C-alpha cells in the first residue's frame, strides 16, 4: 500500500521540444527543411544514458498522409537527462527519401546499445482512405494490397547511440503477413525482456527479436483480436502485456501472454481512451513494483492526458494518477494526443506528448508540437485527484 517516492520532493518541468512552424524558432533540419507539424513522438533511454526523441516531421500539413520524414533529436550529452532546452541537440532527420511518409517511430534499445527503430512506409500518393486532397491537387489512391500501395515495415539502426543511422531495410515480406494492405508498427516503443528477448508491438502481432544483441533474428507472433496501435510491457510477474487503442471510442484493450501465446482481449474499464494511441512503461521490479501507463483518460478527447501507476503484479488495475493539466505548458497549444515515456538516468519519467493549436479546428493546417516533460513519481503520487 505504502510508497516511498511519494515522500520524495515532487518535481516536474516541460517544455515544447518540437516546435511546429508557427512558433518562434520553430525547428528545421541543417538542409533548411521545415515542417509544418511534428506529431507520433518516441522515446527512449539508451545504455549511455543519452535520450533519443523521435517524431513524424510532417512537411505540410498536420495529415497522416503525403509528405513525411522521420525526424530526431538527441540530448548533448549523455548525462544531462535532458532537464532543460539548451540539454537538446537541433532537430535531426533518420529518413526522408521521397515524397512518400516515413513514420510510425518504435524504437527499442538493445543490449550492446544497438538502437533499432521500427518503421512505417507509405508511397506518396497511397493514403488510409483514399480520394484526400494532397497540396498539389494530386487525388490519393486508397492504401492496398499491392506492392507500391501497401503499408511497409521498414528497420533502421545506429551503432554509435544515435548520431547516424542506417539506411532503412525493408522487412515487409518478412515481417507482415502476405496480402495486407493497411499496417502500423507501434508507434511508441519495443522492450527487453528479463529473459533477453524484443518484443516490437504492431497491428495484429508482435516482433520478436532472438539472440545476439544488436543482431537480432526476428519472427512474428501473430495475436488474435488486437489493434492496429499496440503497446507492450512486461509486468512485474514476468508475463507480456498488450495494451492497444480500441477501435472504436471507448476503453483500452488489453490481453496478457508470454512469447508462447496470448489470451483474449478486453477492454479495461479502468482506462478511458477517445480511440487514441497511449504508452506504457516498465518502471522497476522491485517492492513495490511499478509500471506507469499515460493516455487521454476520455472516452471522447485526446485532451485528458493523465499518467498512472499500477502496482499490480499483471497490471491489472492502475491508480487514478495525474492529470497533465496540473502541469501545464504555455504556448504551445492544447496539450494531448499519441504519447512515449521513457526512464531517465536522475530516476524522473521522461513524456513525450503532442500538443494541438487547433487554429484550423479539426483540419489540415492545425499546427502540431510535441511536449516534454520530466516528472518523478512523487509528483504523480501527491495529484490531487488519487
Ligand atoms: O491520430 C490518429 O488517429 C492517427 C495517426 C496516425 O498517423 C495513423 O496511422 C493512425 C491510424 O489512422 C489509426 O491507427 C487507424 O488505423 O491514426
Ligand atoms: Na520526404
Redesign the pocket.
Known sequence: INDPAKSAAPYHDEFPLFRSANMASPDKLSTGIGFHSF??PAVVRTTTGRILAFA?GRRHTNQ??GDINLVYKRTKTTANNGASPSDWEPLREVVGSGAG?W??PTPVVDDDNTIYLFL?WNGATYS?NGKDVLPDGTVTKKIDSTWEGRRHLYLTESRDDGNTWSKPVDLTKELTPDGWA?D?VG?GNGIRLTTGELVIPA?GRNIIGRGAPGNRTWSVQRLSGA???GTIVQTPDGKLYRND?P?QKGYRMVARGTLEGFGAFAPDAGLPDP???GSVLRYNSDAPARTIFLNSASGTS?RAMRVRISYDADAKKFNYGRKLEDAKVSGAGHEG??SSMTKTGDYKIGALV?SDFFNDGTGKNSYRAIIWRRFNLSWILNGPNN
Open positions: 506529431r507520433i513524424e497522416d498522409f511518409t513514420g510510425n512505417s488510409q493497411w502500423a508507434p497491428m489493434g492496429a496501435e487503442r477501435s480511440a487514441c494511441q485526446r494526443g499519441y503532442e
